[PDB]
Amino acid sequence: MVTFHTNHGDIVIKTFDDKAPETVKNFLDYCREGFYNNTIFHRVINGFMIQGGGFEPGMKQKATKEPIKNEANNGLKNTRGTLAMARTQAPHSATAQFFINVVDNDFLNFSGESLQGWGYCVFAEVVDGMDEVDKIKGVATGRSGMHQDVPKEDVIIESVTVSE
């Protein structure tokens, strides 16, 4: 189990270790070494998702480990409350950034091993604290640097608790 202790409340997450093995191992290693502590939710788009895990408060990007292979063909779908990996346009490029689906985003699911079909790998799900996720999706956002939909006031993951 993982808990995100944020400055808007606690979010409790269950991982799908069995369905996304490398992705969950990568996510938990960042969690266990303190990588997500003092990290923000840098991209908030109401009616779509909230994304975090890459930047500290003044949009300072943190150093990541090597990218992981896309495990999206695992039967899990981008439904409301699930966590999936963000990445670049290459399929096997995810490192530490994740997003939480705040609605069902079926357009993000795997449909084939191709640049447009690979989709986004679901690896976890919110079991407690979705009211907290719904407070964050509705915050006022703007532009920071070349980043759009950045919260005007920082939404910070202060600490992460990893429990079995």
Cβ 30 vs Cβ 66: under 8 Å: no
What residue ranges do the domains of the chain occupy?
A: 1-164
What string of DSSP letters covers the chain?
-EEEEETTEEEEEEE-TTTSHHHHHHHHHHHHTTTTTTEE--EEETTTEEEESSEETTTEEPP----B-----SS----TTEEEE---SSTT-B-S-EEEESS--GGGS--SSSTTTS---EEEEEEE-HHHHHHHHTS-EEEETTEEEEESS--EEEEEEE--
What is the experimental resolution, given in Å to one decimal place?
1.8
CATH superfamily of 1-164: Cyclophilin-like (2.40.100.10)
> How many residues are there in the chain?
164
Report how far residue 161's alpha carbon sits from residue 164's, in angstroms, rounded to the nearest whole number.
10
